[PDB]
Design a protein around this nucleic acid. Structure first.
Ligand SMILES: Nc1ncnc2c1ncn2[C@@H]1O[C@H](COP(=O)(O)OP(=O)(O)O)[C@@H](O)[C@H]1O
Ligand code: ALF
Ligand SMILES: [Zn+2]
Length: 673
RNA sequence: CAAGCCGAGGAGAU
RNA sequence: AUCUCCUCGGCUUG
């Protein structure tokens, strides 16, 4: 019961035979269906040729594999060919390499394939080679960039093609190369002010994919323009003239402190510059081992973060933020006990804690304007999406909807969604839970979704009525793909932000960028095949040379692997904590210090199962990892400082890998008895 | 369900 | 060439 549309056939017509190419069309245009038709045709062709038919699909997002397998690929091609879908959630009880030759239609996340290839290179596992496949398909080709996943794969493919081209003039024997297909909407641009640079970017993409063409549609183009409707653009601007009372009280506290330790901002409050100088102050103070400098800088950084959320968020949230913060601080110090600097700071806070708590309840905003727009549009509808920067923002919006009685009066449903993985002060969602909330939305049980970048790509929905960004602009690709998800016959696109910032300017950029994309695409579609080949070959060669250079510099990077040359100190107090040798490793990942001569030092805490460690000052250090019955105390380099044996250059890495010198794996024979 | 390692991209600054 | 903030994927342990 497979179906196709005219423009679909037109755009794919080259690839139906040979022509490893790309496809560029707006969202929800049957790209997936195009791919499915091509898969079926390609395999049928292989069978009629008495030749092995292997296909594979690659998606950046884990959600997307399940989506494609569920709704598009498995249904149509189930009867004809075996199909299977893989991801991180899935368990490859068989393995990858084996299923490569079992199900004959693979769908997989990228890093899986790469991992198998890399293992093959290592020889640890049988692994897999490109030859095994006959047709490699891709989605969201735009990711194919300097060190992106896809690009790693393609770099291998390109290398092999160069070898085959070398053989072409040396020896008849050659190694097969699978046909490569590409599927995207916006190949995107590398932030090029000029359109010549943009067309160069495009050509770089094509070369990274052995494109031979972009091959967009022209003839049925009108049918598509009719078929697909663009949401009406809407600018929303709100200025934070109010909020002076509360914010200014806090700003005065900040000034008090910068004077309290001679902190010259050299910039304003409510930005990143201030944060970054605060961090550089922290760096300097650790290089000094001095207090009142990194600690005060860190507290000021916390305050600036509170302010910057205030720029877009209800102040109550910032008060809760810092309330929890200093709560933990007091708990740490009491646990340690069970100086003037911290005393000044904590008291300085608590002196205004309750008063500022009272202030936080006062009204007077962008949030109000957003509520108005949402309510109005929902009444107009008689589904909704929100994008913004931070998960915390999504939660705050959900609370704002929950508490505000007007939204209840409207009856609009709403729930927040955020990305999998833990991001430090947010409860990490679950892939399963993401599916749940998504279906709740797709079942009408949720009418107003909240999401981060993850939602911007894929997440195909039949029809969404409202799309509203809230103070979120990064790059045109993000914005355009976000607009694509509107998907309703009558769609609306909104963008909210302050008028002081250049956010609106960035929006206008992305508009101009969209224009430039076509301006360049039409310049390349109408290009010489020979000149096209020359440019693409040069770009592919350049990319491969760059990768080789990067590999060589990386190889020369880590060569020291010194056993014990150092001393690890606490960073608040420059107190000795460990030595170069007393450390040991487990899982070739973690580090630990047994030899309870260390144990005489550290302190423990736990509240709410791997308990946390803290210093004799109160500095946080690490966790108590349960491994093989042992409660090994594992520490994070991110919260300590170095001193070499010689010349004492104080340094700091945040990641053990940064450090070339090596430590040994633990031998339990020591701990016996 | 918790914790940890690595890689990547983009926003901002040098 | 380099630093900070937000997102993706994979890997391990409980
Ligand atoms: N042969 C066809 N005839 C009509 N509509 C189709 C056909 N194939 C796919 N579609 C439509 O295309 C949509 C899927 O588009 P898809 O390519 O998956 O989105 P995107 O292009 O954003 O990845 C479906 O909602 C379906 O209605
Ligand atoms: F391939 Al699309 F939106 F165009 F997921
Ligand atoms: Zn300490």
């Amino acid at each position: 019961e497979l179906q196709l549309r005219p423009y679909q056939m037109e755009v794919a017509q080259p690839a139906l035979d040979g022509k490893n190419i790309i496809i560029c069309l707006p969202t929800g245009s049957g790209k997936t269906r195009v791919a499915v038709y091509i898969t079926k045709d390609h395999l049928d062709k292989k069978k009629q040729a008495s030749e092995s038919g292997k296909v594979i699909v690659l998606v950046n997002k884990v959600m997307l594999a399940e989506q494609l397998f569920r709704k598009e690929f498995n249904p149509y091609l189930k009867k004809w060919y075996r199909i299977i879908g893989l991801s991180g959630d899935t368990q490859l009880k068989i393995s990858f390499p084996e299923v490569v030759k079992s199900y004959d239609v693979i769908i997989s996340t990228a890093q899986i394939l790469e991992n198998s290839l890399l293992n093959l290179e290592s020889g640890d596992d049988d692994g897999v080679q490109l030859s095994d496949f006959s047709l490699i398909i891709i989605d969201e080709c735009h990711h194919t960039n300097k060190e992106a996943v896809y690009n790693n794969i393609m770099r291998r493919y390109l290398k092999q093609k160069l070898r085959n081209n070398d053989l072409k003039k040396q020896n008849k024997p050659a190694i097969p190369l699978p046909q490569i297909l590409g599927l995207t909407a916006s190949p995107g641009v590398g932030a090029a002010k000029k359109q010549s640079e943009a067309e160069k970017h495009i050509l770089n993409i094509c070369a990274n994919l052995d494109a031979f063409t972009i091959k967009t549609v022209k003839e049925n183009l009108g049918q598509l323009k009719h078929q697909i409707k663009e949401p009406c653009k809407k600018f929303v601007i709100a200025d934070d003239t109010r909020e002076n009372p509360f914010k200014e009280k806090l700003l005065e506290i900040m000034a008090s402190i910068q004077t309290y330790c001679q902190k010259s901002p050299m910039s304003d409050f409510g930005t990143q510059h201030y944060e970054q100088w605060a961090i550089q102050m922290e760096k300097k103070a650790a290089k000094d081992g001095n207090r009142k400098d990194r600690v005060c800088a860190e507290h000021l950084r916390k305050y600036n973060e509170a302010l910057q959320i205030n720029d877009t968020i209800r102040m109550i949230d910032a008060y809760s933020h810092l309330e929890t913060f200093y709560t933990d601080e007091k708990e740490k110090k009491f646990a340690v006990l069970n100086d003037e600097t911290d005393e000044f700071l904590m008291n300085l806070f608590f002196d205004n804690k309750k008063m500022l708590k009272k202030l936080a309840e006062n009204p007077k905003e962008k949030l109000i304007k957003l509520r108005n727009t949402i309510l109005e549009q929902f009444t107009r509808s008689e589904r909704g999406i929100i994008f913004t920067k931070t998960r915390q923002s999504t939660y705050a919006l959900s609370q704002w909807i929950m508490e505000n009685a007007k939204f209840a009066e409207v009856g609009v449903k709403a729930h927040h969604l955020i990305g999998a993985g833990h991001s430090s002060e947010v409860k990490p969602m679950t892939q399963t839970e993401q599916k749940e909330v998504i279906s709740k939305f797709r079942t009408g049980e949720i009418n107003l979704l909240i999401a981060t970048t993850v939602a911007e790509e894929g997440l195909d929905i039949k029809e969404c009525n409202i799309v509203i960004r809230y103070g979120l602009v990064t790059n045109e690709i993000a914005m355009v793909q976000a607009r694509g998800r509107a998907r309703a016959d009558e769609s609306t696109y909104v963008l909210v932000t302050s008028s002081g910032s250049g956010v609106t300017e960035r929006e206008i950029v992305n508009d101009f960028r969209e224009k430039m994309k076509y301006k360049a695409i039409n310049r390349v579609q109408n290009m010489k095949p020979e000149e096209y080949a020359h440019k693409i070959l040069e770009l592919q060669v350049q990319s491969i040379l760059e990768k080789k250079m990067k590999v060589k510099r990386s190889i020369a990077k880590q060569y020291n692997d010194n056993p014990s040359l150092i001393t690890l100190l606490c960073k608040n107090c420059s107190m000795l904590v460990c030595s170069g040798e007393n450390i040991h490793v487990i899982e070739k990942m973690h580090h630990v210090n047994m030899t309870p001569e260390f144990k005489g030092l550290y302190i423990v805490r736990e509240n709410k199962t791997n308990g946390e460690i803290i210093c004799k000052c109160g500095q946080a250090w690490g966790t108590m990892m349960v491994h093989k019955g042992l409660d090994l105390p594992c520490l994070k380099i991110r919260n300590f400082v170095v001193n070499f044996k010689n010349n004492s250059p104080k340094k700091q890495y945040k990641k053990w890998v940064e450090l070339p010198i090596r430590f040994p794996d633990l031998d339990y024979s020591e701990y016996c008895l």
